[PDB]
Amino acid sequence: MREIVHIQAGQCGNQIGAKFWEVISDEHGIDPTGSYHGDSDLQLERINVYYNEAKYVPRAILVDLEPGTMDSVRSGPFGQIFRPDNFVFGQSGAGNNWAKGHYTEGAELVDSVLDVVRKESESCDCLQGFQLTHSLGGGTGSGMGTLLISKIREEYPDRIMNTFSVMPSPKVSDTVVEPYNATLSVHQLVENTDETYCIDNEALYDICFRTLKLTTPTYGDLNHLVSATMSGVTTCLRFPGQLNADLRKLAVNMVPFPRLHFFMPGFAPLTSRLTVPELTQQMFDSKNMMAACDPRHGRYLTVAAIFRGRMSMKEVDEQMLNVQNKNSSYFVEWIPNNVKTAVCDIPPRGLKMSATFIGNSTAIQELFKRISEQFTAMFRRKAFLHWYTGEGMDEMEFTEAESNMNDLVSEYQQYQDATAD
């Protein structure tokens, strides 16, 4: 289990993807030309996980139906680090239409993308699997991203499929077709991914506005929270360790039921562009969650907590046992020892102390119900269905997508009310 192949699709996928590469490159001492200029041996030990050694080159494929995003990424600080042949771009975008992404424009580009994936996978010694960054609210990332997921799963069934999926909110974009796009996508994520990090624009906006007191949050403000989260949740894959060291061991510890693989990430401290008990309480606080759900409204099936920086392990162990013993009623009693803790010595950029939380909580049903209520409000009035049905799609796909997401909500509620007895 060594190489991960990263795919970034659509505007959001590429923007959060570019930030992910900038952040982990600085952590691993890789400069914008691929040269290593760090001063720690731990930085290079597991560099093969995300980088090909040419000089280090990201094992990243950049996809979009809109060419403008090629230039945007290339113009960025680490833009020239990516392999030029790994940029697979179309001419006519998807216009926020899932059907254009999944069936028409996206279907025409998908084979050129799979050719590049194949080339990157055949060069891997022991391919762990795939990491996809995308939004669910648009057309490319959602429609073409889920098409790519389906085609990769059929060609690489033995590999782990992991996504960083950004959920739409009226607070950030407010284009009323986003609930359709997102519902049609969750349908695909439930069946074809092993693990999904739910990055909710509702939560990112609320953190920026209410906690960080940013009057008008930008995508840069939201993406600062996303990049800190992506760095945090991939620490165990990128540095030596014994807990959740690869995608499969992470899945086996975090996923008790195959469809309930949507994680609520959290991070402390929250900052705009700290002791061990503070890190521990903030990590578990609703205000620090990247999914707009209150964990105290459900129960934790499983949890992974990653602490970063120089700190007392006996203090981390005491504070972690304290939260479970104090708040016993929020962790399912029928999954014994369901909270696992890691500590990485290397801290993130600009901080001495940090903590990342990955929860598989039944409270994530609040996110799915919010999307479902918006989907249903729109679908009941059949608003703009023609835009989808005229792009190689059927109306029954809407009813099946609605039904699959409400069954997902029902499954979470089943385990929230379950008792050991």
């Binding site: 009226p170 407010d174 009323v176 609320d206 707009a292 209520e373 009941r380 608003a383």
Partner: protein, 155 residues
Amino acid sequence: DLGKKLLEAARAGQDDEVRILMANGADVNATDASGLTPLHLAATYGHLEIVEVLLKHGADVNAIDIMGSTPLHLAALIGHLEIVEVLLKHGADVNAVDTWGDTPLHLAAIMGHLEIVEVLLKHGADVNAQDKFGKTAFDISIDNGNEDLAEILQK
């Protein structure tokens, strides 16, 4: 049939075709198979100038389709603020109730159209109106954790 052509021109935002069709006797209150009128379609698709033209020439501002949707429900659902305002200026029933028990306030609340919610409340939207599941717009805001909306709904 000019009725079908007017319905399509109102939906497509074809201002000059709406004008020519009306000049040839097109029924301003024509209905499609589901009971939607040119005003419902212009309101749904955000065509403010066509909304105004239809209302100046006898369009029923409170017409209902088969599901009980009025143009105001659809402008509130889609989030067309200026259209909501024109419709209310022309006598739109702020508390019209569709077949799901929804009022324009419920739809603007669900979709997070906060400015529209404020206008509807200013024009007398019923905070006690319950949908078929017993939920008011305030219940929707509490149940979905929308704190900005819950504050707005409480003024």
